[PDB]
Structures are given as structure tokens and as C-alpha cells.
Amino acid sequence: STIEEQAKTFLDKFNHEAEDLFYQSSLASWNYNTNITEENVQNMNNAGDKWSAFLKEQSTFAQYYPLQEIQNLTVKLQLQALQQNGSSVLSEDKSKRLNTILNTMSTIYSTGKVCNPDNPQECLLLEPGLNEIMANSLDYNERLWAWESWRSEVGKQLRPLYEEYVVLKNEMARANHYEDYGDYWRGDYEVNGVDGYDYSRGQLIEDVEHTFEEIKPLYEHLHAYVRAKLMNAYPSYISPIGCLPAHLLGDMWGRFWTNLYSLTVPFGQKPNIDVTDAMVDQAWDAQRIFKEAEKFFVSVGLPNMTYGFWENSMLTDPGNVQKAVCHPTAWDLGKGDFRILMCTKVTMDDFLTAHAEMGAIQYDMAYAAQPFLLRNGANEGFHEAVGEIMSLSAATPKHLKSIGLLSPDFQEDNETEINFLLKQALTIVGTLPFTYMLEKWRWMVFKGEIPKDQWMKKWWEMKREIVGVVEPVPHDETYCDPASLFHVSNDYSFIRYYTRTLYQFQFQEALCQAAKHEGPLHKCDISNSTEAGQKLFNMLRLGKSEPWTLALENVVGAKNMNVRPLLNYFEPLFTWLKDQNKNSFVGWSTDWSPYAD
């Protein structure tokens, strides 16, 4: 019995027993979400405790098999994922500490309550309500209160708890043999043992840094153009050279500038490309939205969402009776079960979000015929990029004609493309500085470059410099603004939200070439192109069996992250934005302040 043949029969036992265990724990995790209840939360913990406990024993047995003297490449990768020590190294209740503080963080957001001073009854959560203030209100005073009170009341509360979060999770450092908690999340991109393709964790920094510099030209001009529109709609508050205030951006944090499309509309007399005003006039419920999404991909080639999807998914808000997490989540349970949980709304954003999550489902479906561990896409950015590759096609003005939202006229004017591109830039271009900034400060925290006595404050200097956004009110370190966002509170990577972005244009370029599109990339619908769909499914199935740097090359010529497709997609917008912003100042001052007055 060769050691690899012993390794396969061990792995063969794992894939059978683990799939049911993962399904059982994931089934309770769905129920916890659907019917938030002390009993359901406990069911997730006890069943989830078994999944973790099951993982630890198989992990110890996997170490007995050496990572050497095995040759089938899938066998090596499968063994590494199991052989990782994991969160077991922390001694007993110390791990339970990490469980409790993290378990607290899911609750603090769900229970995070800001209360109106005028009416002490009237307290709000980060339900759609608070986010709706940031999305629609045009009052500087109103937005600031929701911006401030949230992290005044709830942020500070999480500051000691996020303080121990790093302290206790960086205990893993040199226990799990990674140097800092930033090194662990970067291990997702790591590929080793492949000649000519070995990608080290440090390469990801240098790559991100270089591509971001080429992103800066387009972003600064967008930042300038947005400032001019904002200064008219907000006299006095905004200085023509100063950093943009955070609350007047779309979200509670400013992650997506797509909310400001109404204020920042280039032309506005031509037909609207934001078709939420048409969806309400086209009476499209959530079932219609997803049914049109299901129809999009079956046109490409993937068959229908399994009936277990439509039967067991939650695509509508429960109502008052049931309290559930409303965040878009492309759940995948294994054992042939695929569901989507997403409180859905009558908005183009929710129309475009649904198309991305279903593309992620069909990703989760395409590589089902793989060993258990290799079924998670080849890196984190892939899973999040596949859906947006389709989403870029979904919003295209030509495809919006076929859906029935834009009228049959289709004015293909030189202006409508810019209207469409700027809505796309706000959603796509704006989030990349915010992403790099957040994760840069996150990585630097794990390394220890910023002590707690310099925390928070540094965050704001970095946010002023990189993203060009200023704080309305100065914050002591008792404030904890970074952990006002779900991705930071629930210990989820956020740079995975930027690798996908450079990726999402890398692939579409090749998919349009596969469809033999005659023209630019923003004119590209993957619809009715069986060949481009076969190209995706051919490499969706690979999962993590083939290194990402290899799977990238097979689809698109590049073996690594390249910003060049993104620039080409935005090149018409970049040239126009330069001409308009010739008088206004491009750039910002790191020293301006809305409170220094």
C-alpha cells in the first residue's frame, strides 16, 4: 500500500461522511437565518460544533499522511486543506472566547439600535431604514446623524471586542504557522508545488499596489466630477479641493457610489438607464426578477435552477412574523441542494444583485462532480467574479431592451453610453479605493504596524488619502468605525471584493471574443452565445483542482491579475471625464476638514 493509495481511501471516507455533516450544519444555519430564535441559534451552534469537532479528528489523522510522496495533484491539495490545524490550537475556552465574541458580533449588528432624540420610542436598526436614509435623503443634518449615531452608539461598543479579536486571532500566528491574520486570508491565493505558476502570498500585495496606481487616474476624475455635482446640491458644506464627506456617499459607509446616480446623472433628459422607475411601472415582483434571471442563464446553456432552489429559497422579505438576515447570500448546502437567500426589493440594484447570486449558484452547480474540498472555486475572487461577469452583461443597454424595461425605442446615443458607463463606474470604480483602504488598514493591524493608541485615527488619514473621503466629526480611539461594516464584524475577507473586479473584466473580454462581438466591451451581451457559455462551464467545473493562475490562463491569456481590461471598458468614460473636469481641480487635499471651521 503506497502512501498515496492510503491517502485516497482516507479521503474517500472523508467525502462521504463530511458531506452529510456539512449539509446538516448548513441546514440549521439556514434555519437560524430564516427564523431568528434563541432555539434556532443554539441548533446552529450544537450542530456547527459537531462539524468543527469532526474536522479536528480528521485533521489530526490527515497529518499522519505526509504531504510528500503523493503525486496526483488533487490529492496534495485535498490533504493540505484537511491538514491545516485550524482554530483548534487555541486552548479550549480560549477558542470559546473567540466563538462568543464573534457570536456577539452577529448579534450586535442585528440588535444595533440607534434611537431618535425627538421621539424616544422611535429607535431604528441597520434595517433597510437607516440605509434608506443614506440612500435617498438630501439633508446634510439627517445623513450625519445616522452616520454618527451608529458608530457613536454601536461602534465604540465593538472597539474592545474587536481589540481582542485581533489579539486572540493573531494568537494563531506561528501556531497555524502563518505570520499575521492578513497572511491567512492571503493564503487563499497561494498556489505551491506548480512550476512556473507558484504564486506566493506576498505577490498579492505588490500586484494590488501596482494595478491600483493605474486605477487612480480614472478614480480621481470621478471623484472630481462627483464633487462638482455635490457642491451644487450641497452649497457651503463641500470645498472644491477637500475630501468628500462619507455620509453623502450612497451607503452608511460609502462602499458603492451607485446610489448617487440620480444626483450625478450626466445628461438626464435621455431615457433613464436606472430602470427601477420602470420596474415599478412594469410591476415586477421578486419572483419575476429571479425568473428573468433564471431565464438569462438557461439562454446561455445552464439548465434551470433545481426545483429545490425555487421550493426552498427565500427571495422575499418574511414580514413581521419572521425575522431573518436580509443580506444577499448565495447559499450552497451540498447534497444536491442549492438555495438563494436575499430579501429582495423592486430596485435595479436588487435586479442586478440577483443575477450575480444566481451566477454564483450555477458556479456552485457546475463543479458538483468534484471531491468535497475542491468544490469552492479556485480562489475567493472567482466565486465573487463569476456572478458579476454576468451582471455587467445584465445592465448593458442592449440586454435591457430584451428584458422589457427600456422601451422599444433604444436611443443608442453617444450620451446614453456615458449615462450607462457612469452608473457602472459608480458601482464598480468607486468601491475599489474603499476596498484597498479597508483591507490595507486591516492587514496592517494584524502585522501590528498601528498600535491601538494610533488606531482609528490612522484609519481616517488613510481614508482621506487613498479614497479621498473625510470624516464629518473627529473620532477618538474609543470610536470603532471600521467595525461598522458587516464584512469586518463577521471576520470575512474584503479584498476578495477587488480581485473579482479586475477579474470580471478579464473574462468578459474573452467571452465577447468567443461570441465574436463587433465593437467595444460595453456593447457585449453574453446572451444567446452558446459558445461563450460553454467556455465558462468548461472552467467553472475545475473548481480548485487546477490552480487559479492556471485556470485564468486557459480562459484569458493572462496568468495573473491585469487591470488592462477594466481600463478598456471605461476608456470612453475616462476620456470624456477628462474633458469635462478641465477647469475643476482633479485631486484632493489631505488636510481639509468639514469640522476645522
Binding site: 474517500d12 461522511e17 452529510d20 449539509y23 441546514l27 433545481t306 429545490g308 447534497k335 444536491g336
Partner: protein
């Protein structure tokens, strides 16, 4: 007289795949027409004889092998399909004269929380010969260490249970299978 096909197909319970029940059907008249015209069966692959031809065809002896397997594995109840089930549980002769009948049992053999009753052999030192039922629950020794009849390193219980939750996908839902063979009983 009416062949007792009713109790084989309408049984309250079906046996596991590693111990497939065999019921002898002999000296009775059998209407095969109800089977190929029931419309309640997903798979009905008669490998040797056409169902039309065997309706009036007398036969020496009939036996019914009934077991429950996964739908992904229904492919394997077939001459020369390999795979785990045919390899270590139930293999067909590859000269097989007979029929394979299958229908979904998600309504009956799947329950909330999952049913773990059905078992399948996962490890076997040597591939099963046609029509050989093995129920040896001896730890498959995978390495150099001897298992001494207890679980341990490279010492796995050769039996693993199916999990059947109703929300599973079609490829993972439980399917009820009845295998019919003919030897050389009319209609």
C-alpha cells in the same frame, strides 16, 4: 394465479443495498403490462428481452431483488458501469437477461432531519462477483497496521449509511429499485 408482484413493489419497507432482499416468484401468471404501463417509474431498462415479447413468454423461475440506492447511483445498476455500488454492493452479470425498475422514494424514504437507516458497503478488498451478496462487517485494513477489529488509523468501518433529507437534490434523493431476472411462469 396473480403473481405476487404487488407486495414487492408496494412494500412498506425496502432492504438496504448491501443486503438486497430476493423474493422467489414462481408458478403464477404475471401481467408485466402493469409494470411497463404504470407511468410511475423513472427507469425501466430491460436488457435482455423486450417487455412486449415476455408478456406471453413462459419462464422457469422468477426472483425479485429489491434495494434502495441513490439516484446518482441508479446508473450503476447496469451491466458494466463500475462505480462504488456495482463494485462493492450489487453487480449484474454483463450477460444479464432481465429488467431494472426504479422510482423516486423521496416521499417515503426521506424524513426531516435525515434517515440514516440505509447502508452501503464503501470498502471491499476484492470486487464483487455477479449476484454475490456480501455482508462482512470487518474493518477494511487500508495500510500496514492490523485493525484487530476496531476503528483506527487506516482502519475504517467498511459500512457507511446513506443520508436522506427531503430537501436534497434529485441526484441525492433516495430511489427505490426492483431488479427482475429470468432463467432458462407465463402470462
Amino acid at each position: 394465479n396473480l403473481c405476487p408482484f404487488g407486495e414487492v413493489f408496494n412494500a412498506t419497507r425496502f432492504a438496504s443495498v448491501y443486503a438486497w432482499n430476493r423474493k422467489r416468484i414462481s408458478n403464477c401468471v404475471a401481467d408485466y403490462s402493469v409494470l411497463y404501463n404504470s407511468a410511475s417509474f423513472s427507469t425501466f431498462k430491460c436488457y435482455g428481452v423486450s417487455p412486449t415479447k415476455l408478456n406471453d413468454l413462459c419462464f422457469t423461475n422468477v426472483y425479485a431483488d429489491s434495494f434502495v440506492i441513490r439516484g446518482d447511483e441508479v446508473r450503476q445498476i447496469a451491466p458494466g458501469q463500475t462505480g462504488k455500488i456495482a463494485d462493492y454492493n450489487y453487480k449484474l452479470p454483463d450477460d444479464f437477461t432481465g429488467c431494472v425498475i426504479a422510482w423516486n422514494s423521496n416521499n417515503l424514504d426521506s424524513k426531516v432531519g435525515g434517515n440514516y437507516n440505509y447502508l452501503y458497503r464503501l470498502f471491499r478488498k476484492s470486487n464483487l462477483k455477479p449476484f454475490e451478496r456480501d455482508i462482512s462487517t470487518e474493518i477494511y485494513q487500508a495500510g500496514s497496521t492490523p485493525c484487530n477489529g476496531v476503528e483506527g488509523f487506516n482502519c475504517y468501518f467498511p459500512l457507511q449509511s446513506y443520508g436522506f433529507q427531503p430537501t436534497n437534490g434529485v441526484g441525492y434523493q433516495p430511489y427505490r429499485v426492483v431488479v427482475l431476472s429470468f432463467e432458462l411462469v407465463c402470462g
